[PDB]
Design a protein around this motif. Structure first.
Motif, PDB file in Angstrom:
ATOM      1  N   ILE A 105      -0.683  -6.476  11.153  1.00 48.85           N
ATOM      2  CA  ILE A 105       0.440  -7.255  10.632  1.00 48.85           C
ATOM      3  C   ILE A 105       0.304  -7.490   9.127  1.00 48.85           C
ATOM      4  O   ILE A 105       1.304  -7.488   8.401  1.00 48.85           O
ATOM      5  CB  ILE A 105       0.558  -8.575  11.432  1.00 48.85           C
ATOM      6  N   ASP A 106      -0.916  -7.691   8.624  1.00 50.50           N
ATOM      7  CA  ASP A 106      -1.124  -7.679   7.176  1.00 50.50           C
ATOM      8  C   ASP A 106      -0.828  -6.281   6.644  1.00 50.50           C
ATOM      9  O   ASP A 106      -1.417  -5.302   7.110  1.00 50.50           O
ATOM     10  CB  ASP A 106      -2.556  -8.099   6.827  1.00 50.50           C
ATOM     11  N   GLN A 107       0.085  -6.172   5.673  1.00 50.56           N
ATOM     12  CA  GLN A 107       0.669  -4.871   5.337  1.00 50.56           C
ATOM     13  C   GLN A 107       0.093  -4.260   4.057  1.00 50.56           C
ATOM     14  O   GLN A 107      -0.396  -3.128   4.092  1.00 50.56           O
ATOM     15  CB  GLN A 107       2.200  -4.990   5.296  1.00 50.56           C
ATOM     16  N   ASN A 108       0.150  -4.960   2.922  1.00 49.88           N
ATOM     17  CA  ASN A 108      -0.794  -4.690   1.836  1.00 49.88           C
ATOM     18  C   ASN A 108      -2.101  -5.355   2.254  1.00 49.88           C
ATOM     19  O   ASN A 108      -2.184  -6.584   2.284  1.00 49.88           O
ATOM     20  CB  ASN A 108      -0.278  -5.232   0.501  1.00 49.88           C
ATOM     21  N   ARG A 109      -3.107  -4.565   2.628  1.00 47.62           N
ATOM     22  CA  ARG A 109      -4.203  -5.102   3.442  1.00 47.62           C
ATOM     23  C   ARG A 109      -5.291  -5.740   2.571  1.00 47.62           C
ATOM     24  O   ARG A 109      -6.471  -5.379   2.569  1.00 47.62           O
ATOM     25  CB  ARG A 109      -4.722  -4.027   4.391  1.00 47.62           C
ATOM     26  N   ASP A 110      -4.826  -6.764   1.850  1.00 47.18           N
ATOM     27  CA  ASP A 110      -5.592  -7.680   1.017  1.00 47.18           C
ATOM     28  C   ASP A 110      -6.316  -8.753   1.825  1.00 47.18           C
ATOM     29  O   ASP A 110      -7.177  -9.448   1.273  1.00 47.18           O
ATOM     30  CB  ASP A 110      -4.639  -8.342   0.010  1.00 47.18           C
ATOM     31  N   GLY A 111      -5.988  -8.896   3.110  1.00 49.52           N
ATOM     32  CA  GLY A 111      -6.509  -9.954   3.950  1.00 49.52           C
ATOM     33  C   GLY A 111      -5.550 -11.097   4.208  1.00 49.52           C
ATOM     34  O   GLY A 111      -5.935 -12.063   4.881  1.00 49.52           O
ATOM     35  N   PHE A 112      -4.315 -11.015   3.705  1.00 49.80           N
ATOM     36  CA  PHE A 112      -3.356 -12.113   3.753  1.00 49.80           C
ATOM     37  C   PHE A 112      -1.935 -11.577   3.900  1.00 49.80           C
ATOM     38  O   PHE A 112      -1.555 -10.619   3.223  1.00 49.80           O
ATOM     39  CB  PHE A 112      -3.428 -12.975   2.477  1.00 49.80           C
ATOM     40  N   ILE A 113      -1.145 -12.209   4.765  1.00 49.60           N
ATOM     41  CA  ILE A 113       0.303 -12.029   4.711  1.00 49.60           C
ATOM     42  C   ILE A 113       0.809 -12.682   3.427  1.00 49.60           C
ATOM     43  O   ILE A 113       0.513 -13.852   3.160  1.00 49.60           O
ATOM     44  CB  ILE A 113       0.982 -12.629   5.959  1.00 49.60           C
ATOM     45  N   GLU A 140       6.227 -10.239   1.111  1.00 54.53           N
ATOM     46  CA  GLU A 140       6.525  -8.812   1.150  1.00 54.53           C
ATOM     47  C   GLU A 140       5.836  -8.136   2.329  1.00 54.53           C
ATOM     48  O   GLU A 140       6.442  -7.302   3.002  1.00 54.53           O
ATOM     49  CB  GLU A 140       6.116  -8.154  -0.169  1.00 54.53           C
ATOM     50  N   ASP A 141       4.567  -8.473   2.583  1.00 49.84           N
ATOM     51  CA  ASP A 141       3.865  -7.925   3.743  1.00 49.84           C
ATOM     52  C   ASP A 141       4.623  -8.231   5.033  1.00 49.84           C
ATOM     53  O   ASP A 141       4.793  -7.357   5.900  1.00 49.84           O
ATOM     54  CB  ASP A 141       2.438  -8.485   3.794  1.00 49.84           C
ATOM     55  N   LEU A 142       5.153  -9.451   5.135  1.00 48.33           N
ATOM     56  CA  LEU A 142       5.917  -9.853   6.310  1.00 48.33           C
ATOM     57  C   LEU A 142       7.226  -9.079   6.429  1.00 48.33           C
ATOM     58  O   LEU A 142       7.518  -8.516   7.487  1.00 48.33           O
ATOM     59  CB  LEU A 142       6.186 -11.355   6.262  1.00 48.33           C
TER      60      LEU A 142
HETATM   61 MG    MG Z   1      -1.593  -8.593   2.692  1.00 48.42          MG
END
Ligand code: MG
Lengths: 147, 98, 49, 152, 150, 147, 147, 49
Positions: free
Chosen positions: D25-33, D36-38
């Motif tokens: 579910i985290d889309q830019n996989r920085d570790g956080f929604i 934009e990721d959502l």
């Molecule tokens: Mg992210």
């Protein structure tokens, strides 16, 4: 007499409540006596250990916070163990119903096949039963002729 | 006297039934109450649509369950075919007797 | 079909006299006479036997 | 609500499934929604439309959501629920013949009468999305799927 | 009261589990069944007696408070007409026409439905259900012991 | 079988329908009885060891089949001939080639009534009885076609 | 009825005693709190602040005592709950084993009664054929008489 | 990469389990049908005897 029994029970509850109220008012009055001796005898004093009084107050408040966070643990632990007990209860009851279903299935198949055998056997026994009477008639007819 | 014992036993059994059925209702209605709000929550319906994908992450239990099903069916079919052939040979003997 | 006991209920054609009685009435009246003899036998003969 | 260790709320398999979910579910996989990721996930899985109004819910979990925060926000709405098998076993107490069904009126009576009571409005609000038979049969077996794996 | 409060605390809950007024009250018709749920064996005569011989419709309408139910239970707990297993087996044997320790289920149903304080056929079928054998015979010693220990 | 699973049982409901049917095909109006039966029957009702009904068997005797052919001056043949002729709908009249009562010469007296009954309604009662007993429409039509 | 009435009225007397003592302590404590707070109010403001410090510290001490008491009661409740849960797990296992034994009993009873039925049925068939033969002999002896 | 993937191996194993199960299930159903039919033939031959 059994009406008086509950009249007495109700009045006993009322007495116990009033006595608990009295006990609390006694606790209050006795504490207030000592607090009044503090108000009017060499006390309410300044600077000598007020930083230590604050330290003690802060340590007490910290202990209340420690107890509250441990309660915030214990509440969820009790919730989870109760929910586990509920899962146990509901699965146990459904398991009793499931074993009753198994017992009924055992009877359903075994008794149906065996009773089909017993039905064929009973239809054969009906022939044996009529043969009893046919033989009785035959021997009675011969006895009727033998005279 | 004995009818009073029987009626007591029946009432007590029906009470125990109510008691367990009430704990089942407590579970059911508590879960459905939580569902009624959680059902409508955007993050929940998002996660549940993701769930078929992440559900690919799965354990091996279905293969061994199928192995057991296979064994049970295989043994039953072998028994059935043996009884079939015994009955068929007996039937051929009935042909000879006819 | 595993009946343990039975109750039988008999309703024969009753005693007939028409303006014209035939083979059908002979068999009916014979059946009624047999059932009446069953009554007589049960009540008066098997009892005293 | 209560502040226990988050693991107490979830079986290891359930929190493992949430870990898998959040890693998808985290889309830019920085570790956080982030928002934009959502909306990226929502459009990627869902249809073409995007609804920034949902940002008024992403904010609800404070700051950019770490996995412990993601688990917290799901778990606090998810608490007070139980496994599928025990919900089926609970329905079995009422479907005495194990037909797999309860009558619509009889389930409404059961829910409204006893325990901590549902309102008839809440029962009808279940029925507005639950599977149902025009003959009256509530096929509760399906309802246990719809309540956990479904919602279309 | 002349009764142990530790079980009075349980009786409060067990009474409240009969809830259908919407509060801490229950109707005269329930009184016998709650007394039977709490573990006593009151006859319907005893139930009417402790209720003061209400009318058959008043039984549907009038109600007890737990404060009034507790002494009812106490009266039935302290004094009783209840017999015992060694008596009931001697009563059931009156139907044992053969001495094998068994009696016909249809006979026990007919007896319980017709004699004494008549039971419904639905009740009596629930009683005999599960005591079947291939002859339709109930082993009255074990039936009595099970019902009594149940 | 009265029980916790309280019901309107199948065998009970069917057993009660057997007599309406055998009466429709078997009985006739004579000068002595408007529901004269014209056969004997012995109904055997079987009970299990619990005294509940498990089956019934109906045996019949001496049907007066001659009544189908010819009748005395105020009598009817078997009721079903009148139930069919009066109760059949136009599609059934066509399919079974039914005719006015004065066309048939096996109906010696033509149309004859029974006070307080209507053959068109007794037809519907008989067909409901056959449905309840579980005789399918192909067999009910076979019966009416043979009649 | 009379002894319990005397008990009820004596409990009422005790209740009135407790109630009047409660009200006496209520107004006494209100007066005493007013007098004590006037002696705070009249004292200097820093000493007054130290009195509120000691008063709040004593209340916080009581708060920590109540908190630890509650955590002890909840610990006991949790232990009793876990003991009950373990008891349910044990009872579930015992019930499982019991139904297993009963299922094996049903299986063995079904096999035993099947075997007994079939064996006795072979004897029944043999005795049926014996009765066939002996009836045939009886009718043969009759025919040999009639001849 | 597909020869490396384990999931394809687990799917293949599940399919092999299912296929052999289906083989034994087909033989089970066929054997039951054959036994039933032949048993009716045997019973009819007993009656004819
Ligand atoms: Mg992210």
């Amino acid at each position: 007499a059994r009406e008086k029994e509950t009249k007495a029970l109700s009045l006993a509850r009322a007495l116990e409540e009033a006595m608990e109220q009295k006990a609390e008012l006694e606790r209050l009055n006795k504490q207030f006596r000592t607090e009044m001796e503090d108000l009017m005898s060499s006390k309410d004093d300044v600077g000598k250990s007020v930083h230590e009084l604050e330290k003690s107050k802060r340590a007490l408040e910290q202990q209340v916070e420690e107890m509250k966070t441990q309660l915030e643990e214990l509440e969820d632990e009790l919730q989870a163990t109760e929910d586990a007990k509920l899962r146990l209860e509901v699965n146990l009851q459904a398991m009793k119903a499931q074993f009753e279903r198994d017992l009924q299935g055992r009877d359903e198949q075994s008794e149906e096949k065996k009773k089909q055998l017993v039905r064929q056997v009973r239809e054969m026994e009906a022939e044996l039963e009529d043969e009893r009477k046919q033989r009785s008639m035959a021997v009675a007819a011969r006895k009727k002729l033998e005279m | 006297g004995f009818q009073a014992c029987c009626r007591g036993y029946l009432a007590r059994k029906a009470f125990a039934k109510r008691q367990q059925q009430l704990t089942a209702m407590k579970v059911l209605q508590r879960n459905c109450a939580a569902y009624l709000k959680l059902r409508n929550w955007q993050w929940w319906r998002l996660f549940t649509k993701v769930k078929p994908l992440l559900q690919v992450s799965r354990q091996e239990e279905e293969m061994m369950a199928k192995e057991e099903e296979l064994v049970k069916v295989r043994e039953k079919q072998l028994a059935a075919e043996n009884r079939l052939t015994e009955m068929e040979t007996l039937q051929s003997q009935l042909m000879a007797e006819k | 079909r595993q009946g343990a006991s039975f109750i039988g209920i008999l309703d024969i054609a009753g005693f007939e006299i028409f303006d014209l009685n035939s083979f059908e009435q002979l068999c009916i009246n014979y059946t009624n006479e047999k059932l009446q003899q069953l009554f007589n036998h049960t009540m008066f003969i098997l009892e005293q036997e | 609500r209560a502040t226990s260790n988050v693991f107490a709320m979830f079986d290891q398999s359930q929190i493992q499934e949430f870990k898998e979910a959040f890693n998808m579910i985290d889309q830019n996989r920085d570790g956080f929604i982030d928002k934009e990721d959502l909306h990226d996930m929502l459009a990627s899985l869902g249809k073409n439309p995007t609804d920034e109004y949902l940002d008024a819910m992403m904010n609800e979990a404070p700051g950019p959501i770490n996995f412990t925060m993601f688990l917290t926000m799901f778990g606090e709405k998810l608490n007070g629920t139980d496994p599928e098998d025990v919900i089926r076993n609970a329905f079995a107490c009422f479907d005495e013949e194990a037909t797999g069904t309860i009558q619509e009126d009889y389930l409404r009576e059961l829910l409204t009468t006893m325990g901590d009571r549902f309102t008839d409005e809440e029962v009808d609000e279940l029925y507005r999305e639950a599977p149902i038979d025009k003959k009256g049969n509530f096929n509760y077996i399906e309802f246990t799927r719809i309540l956990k794996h479904g919602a279309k | 009261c002349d009764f142990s409060e530790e079980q009075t605390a349980e009786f409060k809950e067990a009474f409240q589990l009969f809830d259908r007024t919407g509060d801490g009250k229950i109707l005269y018709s329930q009184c016998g069944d709650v007394m039977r749920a709490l573990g006593q064996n009151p006859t319907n005569a005893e139930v009417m007696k402790v209720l003061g011989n209400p009318k058959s419709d008043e039984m549907n309408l009038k109600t007890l408070k737990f404060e009034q139910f507790l002494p009812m239970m106490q009266t039935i707990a302290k004094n009783k007409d209840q017999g015992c297993f060694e008596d009931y087996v001697e009563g059931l044997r009156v139907f044992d026409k053969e001495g094998n320790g068994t009696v016909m289920g249809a006979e026990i149903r007919h007896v319980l439905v017709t004699l004494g304080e008549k039971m419904t056929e639905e009740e009596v079928e629930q009683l005999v259900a599960g005591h079947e054998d291939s002859n339709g015979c109930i082993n009255y010693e074990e039936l009595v012991r099970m019902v009594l220990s149940g | 079988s009265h029980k916790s699973k309280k019901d309107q049982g199948e065998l009970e409901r069917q057993l009660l329908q057997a007599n309406p049917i055998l009466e429709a095909f078997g009985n006739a109006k004579t000068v002595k009885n408007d529901n004269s039966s014209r056969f004997g029957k012995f109904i055997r009702i079987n009970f299990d060891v619990n005294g509940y009904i498990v089956g019934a068997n109906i045996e019949t005797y001496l049907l007066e089949k001659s009544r189908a052919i010819r009748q005395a001056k105020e009598e009817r043949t078997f009721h079903i001939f009148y139930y069919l002729l009066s109760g059949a709908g136009e599609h059934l009249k066509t399919d079974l080639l039914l005719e006015p009562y004065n066309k048939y010469r096996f109906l010696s007296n033509g149309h004859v009534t029974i006070p307080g009954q209507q053959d068109k309604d007794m037809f519907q009662e008989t067909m409901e009885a056959m449905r309840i007993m579980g005789i399918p429409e192909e067999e009910q039509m076979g019966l009416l076609r043979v009649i």
